[PDB]
Ligand binder design. Structure first.
Ligand SMILES: CCCCCCCCO[C@@H]1O[C@H](CO)[C@@H](O)[C@H](O)[C@H]1O
Length: 332
């Protein structure tokens, strides 16, 4: 068991192994550090109240299980996980170590006007990461530029897959909607991609209803085919009672965009989820021909998420988390 040291950063106590030096607050809470073992910068996240409620204990476990599963180039994976605690009984704090990428896609759009080649490369990588996440039957659920780390070479990693602004949220989630599927992530990609092209937020809503109104201005009120699938009576007139609008021609909205980019946007930004392109299909779209390699777009091992159905006591979630900490095997 390594030697730990204690330090206080912004009135928070960090107790970490010595291998991690130069702790520096970036935002539980996150510290940048220097990993003397690999000679790289890392982010060390101390979880805040890991075991305070059943709901919290379960989400701490969820977070760890997810991070331990992710083994893909475009998905952030777990570099280390540790606790000061010897024994389960002293177990109270959880720290997660990941690659510090240095910028997010949000910081990047506000400076660089992005070229078409950059948008191909950036969206390609998001989709390649999503093909992997979705093959483990995981939904990101909150894909957005702040969840996208990008380095000097515009190489990209997806943060927080499966863990959860409303600007990138699919309409079905904005309206609650009993049960939705992985296609909500593709709506998000459409929103990101549009903004990487124009430099502007696609649907910068003020609140919830304003968001929905902007979405309908672009894509139009639902067609008869979508309305047939809507089982709830009230949702059905809450609809036929928002302002009647036609679908805009995206060729006319994203002027001066590559026509293949406009075509793929048309296939992502569809109200009806059943008709949205999938991550795998998109990777095969003519827009990424420079980047697509069918032999290098891997799928995930299966992810056992049965725990999601269970209602356990804080102590049990806590012991399950402790088992995961102990069983952790670091990457090559
Ligand atoms: C503005 C009105 C919102 C319409 C959004 C409905 C599109 C979501 O699409 C719907 O999603 C469900 C899964 O979530 C599917 O079971 C339905 O078949 C599909 O039409």
């Amino acid at each position: 068991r390594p030697t730990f040291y204690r330090q206080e950063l912004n009135k928070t106590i960090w107790e970490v192994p010595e291998r991690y030096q130069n702790l520096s607050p970036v935002g539980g809470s996150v510290c940048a550090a220097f990993d003397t073992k690999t000679g790289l910068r890392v982010a060390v996240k101390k979880l805040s109240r890991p075991f305070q409620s059943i709901i919290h204990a379960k989400r701490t476990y969820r977070e760890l299980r997810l991070l331990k599963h992710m083994k893909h180039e475009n998905v952030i994976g777990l570099l280390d996980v540790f606790t000061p605690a010897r024994s389960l009984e002293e177990f109270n704090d959880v720290y997660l170590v990941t690659h510090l990428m240095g910028a997010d896609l949000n910081n990047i759009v506000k400076c660089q006007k992005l070229t078409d080649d950059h948008v191909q490369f950036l969206i390609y990588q998001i989709l390649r990461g999503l093909k992997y996440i979705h093959s483990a039957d995981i939904i990101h659920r909150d894909l957005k530029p702040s969840n996208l780390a990008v380095n000097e070479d515009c190489e990209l990693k997806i943060l927080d897959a499966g863990l959860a602004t409303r600007w990138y949220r699919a309409p079905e989630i904005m309206l609650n909607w009993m049960h939705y599927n992985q296609t909500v992530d593709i709506w998000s990609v459409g929103c990101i991609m549009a903004e990487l092209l124009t430099g502007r937020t696609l649907f910068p809503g003020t609140d919830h209803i304003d968001q929905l109104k902007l979405i309908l201005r672009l894509v139009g009120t639902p067609g008869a085919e979508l309305l047939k699938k809507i089982s709830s009576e009230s949702a059905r007139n809450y609809i036929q009672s928002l302002t009647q609008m036609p679908k805009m021609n995206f060729a006319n909205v994203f002027i001066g965009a590559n026509p293949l980019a406009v075509d793929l946007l048309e296939k992502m930004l569809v109200l009806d989820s059943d008709k949205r392109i999938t991550a795998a299909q998109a990777l095969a779209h003519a827009y990424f021909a420079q980047y697509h390699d069918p032999d290098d777009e891997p799928v995930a091992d299966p992810y056992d998420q049965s725990f999601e159905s269970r209602d356990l006591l804080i102590d049990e979630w806590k012991s399950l988390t402790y088992d995961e900490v102990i069983s952790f095997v670091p990457p090559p």
